[PDB]
Structure formats: structure tokens, C-alpha cells
């Protein structure tokens, strides 16, 4: 048992700050309350008294792992920042970032609830189609915006909580982390992205490009719309196997080149690539998108069922989208500049 000290009291065991309601900072900001938690440190409700306006902190964690880590975060979103358009402003702001009783805080603007949230407020039952088109025509412009030749960044932590309202009166949406994020060539970690939301790609091991966050904005929108994670994988290896049951197994000019193909899947004398052997999951490829969504049913769940803008038409417009984001081969999934286009919106 120890009950030593961690950085004069102020750090708890684990390298976070232990934050007291009702603080007063520097001499600017007023520490209202905790918003939330995570692996890079925590985030807090705070009044710039300054400037008179609400801010969102983050308390990077008191560790120089984290602490370097999150300096790649500042560079991104000031390099981010910088750029002058109008597609900026889906990404959370950075306002400033100062460091602050050994921890590095990072002063971003007020969000609101995020898109679990809304989806744990709806009894897990699923937004509209329409909203579901909605933040899939942000993410997909802001996905654009990352994907310029002067950026190149991955998010490689794209989730719903990582996507948050700007108003709790619905539609306007902005990403919000940049932790676990790598600028194309500058690559580091191999394991990315979170498990519900990981591509093929990385659960091979094969190399990544930008592509891998639109295999997560596909799984994100699916579950938007469903209520459930679409490839609600425990592991690794019932990742991989959840995704073969509806896309079918890889193409073996993928596993071929997969470092991590032995991982999941054995190669026959035929040739054919085939699952490991063992019943749990079912044949691959029944596990079709088409009852997931509901297209020729009454929406997902049947609770779909005569309401406006939920046409059978335009859910096939939504399956064909989804199936052309987790294409499995990121050299053919589609591209924002493309997916913006496509026949949905
Ligand atoms: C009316 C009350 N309501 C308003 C405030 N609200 C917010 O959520 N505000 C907020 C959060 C973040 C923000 C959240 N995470 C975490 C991501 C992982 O999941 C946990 C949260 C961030 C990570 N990296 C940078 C910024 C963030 C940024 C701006 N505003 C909740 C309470």
C-alpha cells in the first residue's frame, strides 16, 4: 500500500491533475467543472475571464510520454488553424496552450454533447436518415480538409465521442482530438485506431495512409443510424472475423502482401485464402449490409417504418455509400473529393 505525494498533491496516481471545483488559474481562468476523460489527460468546463468566453481545457497528463505526444497535437491543430478556407471550421479550435502546474493545457472552444451522447439519448435506437447524411457531408468535407496537400493527416482515432456538437440543437459537428494523429510520411504506431473502428488495413499490419479514417466514418454513420457498433469486435481476431462476415474474406492481393495475415487467416495449396479453422461467427458474407440497414424492410430494427425521407431508394443510395467506404483495398476506397459527389447527397 503507498499513499505518497504526486507533484505536491496537485497530480493524482496516474499523471492526472486532480482537479478542485471552483479553481482560479494564472488569474484568468475559472475552473467550473470536469466535462471528460480519456488516455491523453482529462478536459474541463473554464471561463477566460479575460476574454469573456466559455473554454474547454485539456490537462495533458504529467508524463513526458504524454506530454511529447501532445506537443504533436499543437502543431497539428495550429498548422490547421493557419490554412484559410471555410472547411477550418469543422475542426475543434485551438485558441492557445500554456503550460500549467507541470501539466501542458491546451485551451480549446466550448462543443457540446457528443455523438454517442446523442445516440445514448435517443435509447440507442438511431438518428434519422437525413441527420445521418448530415454529419456524414461535414465529415466528409472536413475529411477533405485533412486530406490537403499542405496537411496530410490522419486522425487514426476517429469514434463518435470524437466528434462534437457545435449547438445541442443538432446538425453542426466539429472533431475534437488530434492525440493519436500523424501527418502522411511522418508515421509512427501501428496500433491506432480504436477497435470498432479499426480498417483492415491496420489490423493486417500493412502500411496506412488517410484512407483508414474513412473505414471508420463509414462504421461511425452505420452505427449512427443503427444504435449498434456495426463490427462490434472484443478482440483483434473477432475484429477481423465480425468484418469478414458481411465484406467477405480479404482479397488475397492484400493478404499476400499482409504482414499480419497469418494472424486470421491461412493460405490453402490451392492458393485461396481462407479463415483460420476451429462454430462462432457466421459464413462469411451472410451478414449482409442490406438487413443491417434495412433497406427493403422497415428501416434498421423495423422502427423505421413509414416515416418520411427513409425511402428504399434512398437507402440503397446509403448501403452503396457505406460499401464504397470499406472497400478493404484503400488504394480503391473512395475519396472525400469523390464521396462528397456520390448520389446520397
Ligand atoms: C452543457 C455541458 N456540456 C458542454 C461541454 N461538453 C463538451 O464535451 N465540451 C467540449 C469537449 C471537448 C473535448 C472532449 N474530448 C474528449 C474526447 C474523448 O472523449 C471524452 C472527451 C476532447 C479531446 N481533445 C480535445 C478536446 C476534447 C472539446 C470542447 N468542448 C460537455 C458538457
Redesign the pocket.
Known amino acids: 500500500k503507498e499513499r505518497k505525494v504526486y507533484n505536491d498533491g496537485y497530480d493524482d496516481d496516474n499523471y492526472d491533475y486532480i482537479v478542485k471545483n471552483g479553481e482560479k488559474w494564472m488569474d484568468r481562468y475559472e475552473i467550473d467543472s470536469l466535462?471528460?476523460?480519456?488516455s491523453?489527460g482529462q478536459?474541463v468546463?473554464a471561463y477566460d475571464r479575460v476574454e469573456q468566453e466559455w473554454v474547454?481545457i485539456?490537462i495533458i497528463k504529467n508524463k513526458k510520454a504524454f506530454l511529447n505526444q501532445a506537443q504533436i497535437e499543437v502543431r497539428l491543430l495550429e498548422l490547421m488553424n493557419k490554412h484559410d478556407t471555410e472547411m477550418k471550421y469543422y475542426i475543434?479550435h485551438l485558441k492557445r496552450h500554456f503550460m500549467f502546474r507541470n501539466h501542458l493545457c491546451?485551451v480549446?472552444?466550448?462543443?457540446?454533447?457528443?455523438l454517442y451522447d446523442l445516440l445514448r439519448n435517443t435509447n440507442f435506437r438511431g438518428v434519422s436518415l437525413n441527420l445521418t447524411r448530415k454529419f456524414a457531408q461535414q465529415m466528409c468535407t472536413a475529411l477533405l480538409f485533412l486530406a490537403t496537400p499542405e496537411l496530410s493527416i490522419i486522425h487514426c482515432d476517429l469514434k463518435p465521442?470524437?466528434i462534437?456538437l457545435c449547438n445541442?440543437k443538432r446538425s453542426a459537428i466539429k472533431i475534437?482530438?488530434?492525440?493519436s494523429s500523424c501527418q502522411l510520411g511522418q508515421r509512427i504506431y501501428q496500433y491506432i485506431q480504436s477497435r470498432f473502428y479499426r480498417s483492415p488495413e491496420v489490423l493486417l499490419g500493412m502500411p496506412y495512409d488517410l484512407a483508414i479514417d474513412m473505414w471508420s466514418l463509414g462504421c461511425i454513420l452505420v452505427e449512427m443510424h443503427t444504435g449498434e457498433p456495426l463490427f462490434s469486435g472484443a478482440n483483434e481476431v473477432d475484429q477481423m472475423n465480425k468484418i469478414v462476415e458481411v465484406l467477405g474474406i480479404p482479397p488475397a492481393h492484400i493478404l499476400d502482401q499482409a504482414p499480419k495475415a497469418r494472424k486470421f487467416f491461412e493460405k490453402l495449396p490451392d492458393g485461396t485464402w481462407n479463415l483460420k479453422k476451429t462454430r462462432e461467427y457466421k459464413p462469411p458474407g451472410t451478414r449482409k449490409l442490406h438487413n443491417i440497414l434495412g433497406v427493403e424492410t422497415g428501416g434498421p430494427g423495423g422502427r423505421r417504418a413509414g416515416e418520411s425521407g427513409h425511402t428504399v431508394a434512398d437507402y440503397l443510395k446509403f448501403k452503396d455509400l457505406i460499401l464504397r467506404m470499406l472497400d478493404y483495398d484503400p488504394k480503391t476506397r473512395i475519396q472525400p473529393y469523390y464521396a462528397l459527389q456520390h448520389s446520397f447527397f
Request: no cysteine.
Open positions: 466535462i471528460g476523460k480519456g491523453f478536459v468546463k474547454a485539456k475543434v491546451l480549446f472552444e466550448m462543443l457540446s454533447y457528443n465521442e470524437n462534437l445541442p475534437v482530438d488530434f492525440g
